[PDB]
């Protein structure tokens, strides 16, 4: 038996939705089929070189042309449900950018620090 | 059953019939499958036949436990 979910193995949806390599966050509770073990390298390399062939007749992962990069997949956020298009079970995985509040010094600051005109096409600008 | 649902529970904490989808164009609208839409087609067809006055032939009225 494997550690990654059986829907990751073979997508629960009829069209094989949610199949392939899904990288997970370290602090996330969900697990993925991306393992760098010497025994798990053959299947994870076949998923990149050849892909998975479904019963319906469509190649899900690596349809062709360009091989994906499994290491740069955004972290897994949930599991696919048949009712909706997607079911989110982990909200902390999705990063939420937030802006700091303004302050008397904040609206006075600038990107660069102050140390103590017609555009001309040039082949090289030193600084 | 006459609407067309097959699984009574979408989750262990809520029924499947009381699932109205948010975050979309239609908020509060109950979710319908293709089977639900086709069963509603059959129901509306039977209703329109009955309103016309001819024999209302509800295709699922002859549906028993063994089919």
């Amino acid at each position: 038996k494997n550690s990654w979910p059986e829907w990751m193995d073979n997508g629960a949806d009829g069209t094989g939705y949610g199949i392939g390599l899904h990288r997970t966050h370290p602090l996330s509770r969900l697990r993925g089929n991306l393992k760098r073990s010497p025994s798990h390298v053959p299947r994870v390399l076949g998923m990149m070189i050849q892909g998975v062939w479904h019963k319906s007749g469509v190649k899900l992962y690596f349809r062709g042309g360009k091989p994906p990069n499994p290491s740069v997949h955004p972290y897994l956020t949930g599991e696919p449900c048949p009712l909706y298009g997607w079911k989110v079970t982990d909200e902390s995985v999705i990063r939420q950018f937030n802006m700091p509040s303004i302050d008397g010094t904040n609206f006075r600051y600038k990107p660069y620090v102050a140390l103590q005109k017609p555009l001309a096409k040039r082949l090289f600008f030193w600084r | 059953r006459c609407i067309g649902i097959t699984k009574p529970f979408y989750n262990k904490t809520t029924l499947r019939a009381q699932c109205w989808h948010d975050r979309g164009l239609q908020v509060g609208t109950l979710v319908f499958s293709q089977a639900m839409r086709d069963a509603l087609m059959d129901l509306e067809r039977a209703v329109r036949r009955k309103e016309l006055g001819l024999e209302p032939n509800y295709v699922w009225d002859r549906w028993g436990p063994v089919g």
């Binding site: 979910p5 059986e6 997508g11 629960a12 048949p82 009712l83 | 529970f9 989750n11 499947r16």
Partner: peptide, 24 residues
């Protein structure tokens, strides 16, 4: 064999998504 031979509804596994059948 020369003669002709002449299907999983829930491939999610044993229990995934909607519960199947009555409990216990």
């Amino acid at each position: 064999g020369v003669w002709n031979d002449v299907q999983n509804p829930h491939p999610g596994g044993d229990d995934f998504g909607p519960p199947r059948g009555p409990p216990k």
